[PDB]
Amino acid sequence: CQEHDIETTHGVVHVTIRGLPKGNRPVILTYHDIGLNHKSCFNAFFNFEDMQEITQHFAVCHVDAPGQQEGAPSFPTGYQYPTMDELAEMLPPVLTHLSLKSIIGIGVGAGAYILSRFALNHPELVEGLVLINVDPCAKGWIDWAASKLSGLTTNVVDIILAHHFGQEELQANLDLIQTYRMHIAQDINQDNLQLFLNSYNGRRDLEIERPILGQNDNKSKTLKCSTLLVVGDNSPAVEAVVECNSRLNPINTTLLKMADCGGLPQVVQPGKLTEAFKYFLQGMGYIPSASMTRLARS
Amino acid sequence: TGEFLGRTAKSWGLILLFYLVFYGFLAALFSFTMWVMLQTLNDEVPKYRDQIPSPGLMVFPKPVTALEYTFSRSDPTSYAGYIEDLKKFLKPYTLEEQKNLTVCPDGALFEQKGPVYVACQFPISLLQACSGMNDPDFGYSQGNPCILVKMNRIIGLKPEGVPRIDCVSKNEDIPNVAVYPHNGMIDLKYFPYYGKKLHVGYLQPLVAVQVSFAPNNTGKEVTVECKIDGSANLKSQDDRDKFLGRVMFKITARA
Amino acid sequence: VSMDDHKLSLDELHRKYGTDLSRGLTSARAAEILARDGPNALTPPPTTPEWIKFCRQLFGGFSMLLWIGAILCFLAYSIQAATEEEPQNDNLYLGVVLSAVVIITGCFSYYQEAKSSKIMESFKNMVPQQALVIRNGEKMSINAEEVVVGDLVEVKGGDRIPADLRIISANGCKVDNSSLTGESEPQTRSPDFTNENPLETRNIAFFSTNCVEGTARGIVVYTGDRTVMGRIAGQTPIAAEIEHFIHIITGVAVFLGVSFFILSLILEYTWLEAVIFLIGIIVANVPEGLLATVTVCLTLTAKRMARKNCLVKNLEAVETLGSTSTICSDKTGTLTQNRMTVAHMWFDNQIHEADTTENQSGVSFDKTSATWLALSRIAGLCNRAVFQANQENLPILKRAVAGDASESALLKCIELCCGSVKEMRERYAKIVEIPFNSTNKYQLSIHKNPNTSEPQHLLVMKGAPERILDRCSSILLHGKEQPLDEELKDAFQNAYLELGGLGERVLGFCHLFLPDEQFPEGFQFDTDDVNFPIDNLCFVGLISMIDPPRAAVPDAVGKCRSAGIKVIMVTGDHPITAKAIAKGVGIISEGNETVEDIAARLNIPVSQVNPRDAKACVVHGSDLKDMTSEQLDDILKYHTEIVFARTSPQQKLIIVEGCQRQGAIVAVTGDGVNDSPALKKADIGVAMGIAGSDVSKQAADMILLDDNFASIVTGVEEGRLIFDNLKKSIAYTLTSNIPEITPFLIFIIANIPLPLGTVTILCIDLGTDMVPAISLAYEQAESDIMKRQPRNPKTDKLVNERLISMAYGQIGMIQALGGFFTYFVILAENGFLPIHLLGLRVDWDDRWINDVEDSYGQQWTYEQRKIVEFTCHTAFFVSIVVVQWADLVICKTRRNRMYPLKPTWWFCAFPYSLLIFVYDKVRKLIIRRRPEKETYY
Ligand SMILES: Nc1ncnc2c1ncn2[C@@H]1O[C@H](COP(=O)(O)OP(=O)(O)CP(=O)(O)O)[C@@H](O)[C@H]1O
């Protein structure tokens, strides 16, 4: 349960490890979304009562953004050299700096893209991924025109809330919009948030293609890990995840469109997301002597 | 179809009420938008005057069929409509109706500028027996019908040069047409026109055409062609519009 | 023509084709033979020359009316230019405009139909038909196209035959030759010559048929065009409803056209003008392209659900998948991940644990017990699963195994605990093998024991724990055979209740040393008519392996409960394991109790339990065989959560028929040859795309590309968004008919100059033609779609009186008033104020009145009036079209001489025609009609 700073290779990234009992068991790497931080993205979920069954059996890490979580040093000129392809490839040094064999990463939004790119670059350090609201596609021009033409005068927190939460969800505040808006405004500073958003706006198209039965063995670049795609049924990223659900090997990937949720499934519906993660991990040979949830409480 | 032969199963009253309210709301929106659009328009001069750039020409009275005047020198009921229309039209031109109007110098545009906008006088005596002062019948009884040729009013149009209406008979020019005043000279003191609201009591210039049917050629069909001659401003040649600076009519006086 | 290799013995096959009949030809030889013959499954049909498909769109339907109108205009201009010198170039331009209208309409129809055709043809390439061949010693599965004449092909149960095979090795293959011989009764296939006619012998299996029992091996002799098959050569309710609606609206359009033609003739129209007005007001009113729009909607939804791993085989499955009210699913593979790991054992009278991480033996136990030795030997021997010869450095559990998931789990467990399963099988040679069958529920094998005290024959058995204990007379405890008694049997049942109560699949293992005096070294062992003592075996122990539910399955069952879909679990596993899994995934939700549960909550016998107090039941398969037809109805009508345990694949048909007698729309799951009648009787037949037989994929109406139950529910949700998007398209098709017919009515009534002519009526119809298609292309989703009870397709109509009252009278009227506003403003800014226009129709339109006075005193000739009228007509058309497109965009954003569009204080344009739209979308919102077409505001 200590906070560690990795060696300055193409930048420095702050990580937080909750323990090192694994030896051989994989760890649970994490990567938050744009404008957020681990204390606001995964802390509200890993401390859940139903998640204690998993947290006590795996080492949980928390890889923050190339910016900062506590304080706001920022950069004078900014110079956001580490892009998503650059951010993904700085993870193997992090793993070698903590003696981590392999990670079961779980990323939200841009963190999901970073983990996917890291898995594509190094399909041996990751055993499985939980891609929440993943978007392996560039903005193109069709939505790029609407992202800036009608939003020339738009605050960055409004842009982040539009990216995360659904249209009606932000239209009608349920005090969750207020809580996460104050989380965005305070804590993490605006400069690094804007820099991260600008870096993420590029989002070069991830190379993934669904294997065809016996013909495309010559060219195929689909993930080799057990994938669990999570997205709320009332979020603006549903189409992105369905696009990622396609062009992905339907033998190991899983698509979960949760019914009564939308926006951030990790905080709105934690009790179902933790059950899904437990079932996803249990089929990988892990936590075998666990309890099947909903079995009449026992 | 049915016991009552209708579909009014306690319905058709609620439907009627709902559509009454919906169309009342829609009509209210439409009427308010129309009113608020009309408030942006002038009451004295059109917003756009580029669709009526040049004056047309027209004849009076309007016949029943096309522009074909037909009557008989004998029957007074054949040309009663012509007489009544000519007398009704020329009433505001008479001596007792132009008394309030003013007298303007000839051969110059009466460019008024100021909230008075007096109108000059067109003396009905300029028509020279094509008015009703000599004979109540405008030459129809005598066999020499009189027809008025008018230039369409355009707000702010100032003709250049010396406007004139040139009517030439096409029926071998045997019934030589008589044009009044003079040779159809349109005077410049009636121009420009300042609108129905500003130019109160405005009387436009008239040209009267009398075709004299001799007994030898009575019963023919004289085709007369008039044009706005003498003013380069006012167009008279156009393929599509046959009445732009022109008018053609046929007069047939049955024996 | 026979020309076959039936009577030609095996030696010539090695010569006639140059392939050795134990390893098949090499990859290079296979490719070389493929290069000169072509793909195996060619069977190419002809196609339409693709210009007939465009000529039919041009000259077809109501485009013939516009062609007739153009011909009439050209004839009128011809007679005009003949009789009169220097004619008016008006009929010529009118004919050219009509011709352009038909051309553009045909182009839209063509590039709307040859996009749905592309989407629908994309699906046929998603699941290529494959084949198992033996090239370069090992078996490599390839596309059936790559199969060539002369290679070795293996076929098994539920396998479509890649091509004509000369069978050289077979144990029990029975092909379904109904495709050629007509009779569907399976015919056995053997490697020997049996009949002169190729179609009647037993050593040849024909192309496009499938072997339905057992396995066989053959040499491909004929490919697609040379095969025996290559040598030989219904309306959905939505379609019927839309066809009826189109016919009714077409009749309405023709009536309106006739009445307007007569009225225009009354208003002094020329005959050539009135005829064109008729053919324009008919064409603009019939719903052209409505069938194309619904085809686009269906194909788009089929494409979008295929992205979610639901592959429909036809567009009728798309509309049926939205009306689902029951889903009969299978536990293993569909509701569970089918990735099992051994976690408990029970051989002695104690439950022994197991664990990964080879070191320390895993928890605390090792090979000390001879009972464990025997149990591990049975598990290793009876398995058919083999590690794929690769990834040796990888961990034993983290490997790749070919076989059943249970057999794979057993193999991995034995390799981790004992090790050297391959050498263990080498020591005990397999004399005869009885494959696992869902009807038998056990796997039997006989092996040779090199042991010292061996009776020279060892019998190995595994299968259902209770079907194995019914033929076991002794229980092996600490290596000592003890008689099977009620002291051990109740302990066995308690162990089953504990291991099975955790949702763990349990298998029973038993053996019997076949006596030597009864079974000598060379005793006859034949699979058919078995002679070994299957009864009276020696029970050894149980092994339980966890099979976790799929991650997205509990949420999917929650969605099904939110909707009115009744999920039924049909499984062959034990009632204990089935009930535990059903409770775990939420099929039996908390609160619901079985009869055996309410007999235990309050201690009374089962016979005293009131059946109506239980809404959840677990029905054994044997208890279903003796049920009458009316007795199954009591199960399905009164119980809201039903589990069918120990149910054979041939009782799925009974279950589906019983569900369909309840007036339900049943979606059933199958992955075998025996499931085919259920997959065809069910309203939606769902086949597993990963581990499903070719026979099931032929019988199914839909293929699960990931074998995931949650994908079925996602496809149901996607197909539910097909009627709300269809009535939207119908309404958008109907909204433009009032802006086109109201100008003439107001013309007649108010006697104003004509607001819209019959060239801009067709221009409005042309501009606002693709709006419904673009609407359903940009349609995102809905919100409460899965909180809505299933559609009743028989008694729920796509078109009701509220949709028609909406389109024809609330949206169309708003658009018409916007166009009228544009017309009024254009006229008023040229001098003719709105109050002046009333009654001006007769002075206007009179070619001989060339001094018509406006509101400002000016006087207009006929042509000067008509230029402004033409401007008003074009502005009306532009306003209608632009506002329709802008309203489309705004509606998809807010909720989930062409004067218009001008900036110079032109709020008369699309600005107001859309401002009335947005001002009435709020009043219809506030009034809040609940029964709710407040949408389409
Ligand atoms: N390879 C195998 N060898 C021997 N017995 C097997 C076996 N696979 C399964 N069994 C046993 O036979 C029983 C019958 O299984 P069956 O094929 O009828 O349904 P299933 O349990 O295999 C999958 P589902 O529940 O989806 O139908 C199983 O419950 C299991 O106990």
Ligand code: NA
């Ligand atoms: Na049409």
Ligand code: NA
């Ligand atoms: Na129409």
